[PDB]
């Protein structure tokens, strides 16, 4: 049975990344959603990493156990900025090419990697790319930190589509997330959607297989379905909503594995 | 003034129908439960915008329930389109702007493909495209009614407005659920007229419900986008005319005005 490496690694951009690896074979990189906590991949990482892949994941810059990082790394955040940082960590880890998953700002990062670093991406798996600045979160940064944490915890839980799996992440994870919510609010929603690499010139350098959440309201990532279809990119639903790796870890892992096997 | 009446067409169907207003014709085809009282509020709003609005209970359903079995068994868009063109002929409706949800939408597409001379513009909403994941429909009829009333209420997105249809409507729906179950879900989804050759004989403006789970009518967004057909969300889910009658009426009116 493969064992899980859990460690830290420094990069030249100043970030002390917390990261984990499991398995052997072609590289698969699992980029977190905006909350930046890779413990949400723990279960499917074992599944994917037993299916003939070396899986790498990490907490995102400024978030959780990667919190030792320069402020610019988690402020005015864009897919392009995060893509640069991920290519730097790939270099340090000796990852030449990878099949890359990401949801939300993680998907913004997938698209920016596919556009800007196609030589490093075997195939991209974006899920629920933010494409508009959300109405409900228009002034979330302007609120007081305790309120940011409380309201964003509620929103995240509602977007999990499996409240029991979400809670079962456990108290350690939800304590880390408490602080991340604030840093996320300050650094992500105002800049991430406008950074989406969703032009024709972004989307056809490498293979892309796009997903949205089956249980999300049609309205929420509607434009993802439009963009992918207009561009003739494979688009389908996954079980759950915004955290498929938490709500439905087996189906998530199967998706990642079958999709990646297409391009081996 | 709302006209409420009946006609026997040549398919053997004793239709219950309603008409209100003056102006270009707008036809509102029910969803698969087949009951046009769901249109009562928005029918008046549309009619007051300068249109003549016609609606009807569907064959075998509600007040149109006297009909031969073939009209409510093995139902397809194409069969329903044939029947509705005969209604149009009998009422003297030459061309119409046609709205429909669910099997109603299947009927819109079949009208647009099969009878383009008769359709000014089509407004499909939530066209069924996949067989509901049917072997279990050899249940008691009361069980079918129970389970289909629950599904329908959950697809309304405004449970208070759904309940507010009132007992007369829900008592009609009770028997309609059973007929619908036996006649519609195995055959309607395959009948969807969604080939490129079906979809470009008249203008179409496609909608899905903003609040429906993405997976349910996902493929509608794909098809419409692939074909460069206008596609957008309406408030609510599967019964916008019930949940959001004002937004619904405004949509039908503004869309129809595009083509005048
Ligand atoms: Na590549
Ligand atoms: Na026409």
UniProtKB/Swiss-Prot annotation, chain A:
SUPFAM superfamilies: alpha/beta-Hydrolases. One of its GO terms (molecular function) is hydrolase activity. The keyword Cell wall biogenesis/degradation does not apply. Optimum temperature is 35 degrees Celsius. Zearalenone binds at residues 34, 104-105, 184, 188, 242. Optimum pH is 8.0. Signal peptide: none annotated. InterPro entries: AB_hydrolase, AB_hydrolase_1, AB_hydrolase_fold. Keywords: Detoxification, Hydrolase. Its EC number is 3.1.1.-. It catalyses: zearalenone + H2O = hydrolyzed zearalenone + H(+). The active site is at residues 104, 128, 242. Pfam families: Abhydrolase_1. One of its GO terms (biological process) is response to toxic substance. It is an enzyme of class 3 (hydrolase). Belongs to the AB hydrolase superfamily. Hydrolase RutD family. Homodimer. Lactonohydrolase that specifically hydrolyzes zearalenone (ZEN), an oestrogenic mycotoxin produced by numerous Fusarium specie, into a non-toxic alkylresorcinol product. This is Zearalenone hydrolase.
UniProtKB/Swiss-Prot annotation, chain B:
Zearalenone binds at residues 32, 102-103, 180, 184, 238. GO terms for biological process: response to toxic substance. Its EC number is 3.1.1.-. Optimum temperature is 35 degrees Celsius. InterPro entries: AB_hydrolase (IPR050471), AB_hydrolase_1 (IPR000073), AB_hydrolase_fold (IPR029058). GO terms for molecular function: hydrolase activity. It catalyses: zearalenone + H2O = hydrolyzed zearalenone + H(+). Disulfide bonds: none annotated. Lactonohydrolase that specifically hydrolyzes zearalenone (ZEN), an oestrogenic mycotoxin produced by numerous Fusarium specie, into a non-toxic alkylresorcinol product. Belongs to the AB hydrolase superfamily. Hydrolase RutD family. This is Zearalenone hydrolase. It comes from Cladophialophora bantiana (strain ATCC 10958 / CDC1940 / 8579 / CBS 173.52). The gene is zhd101.
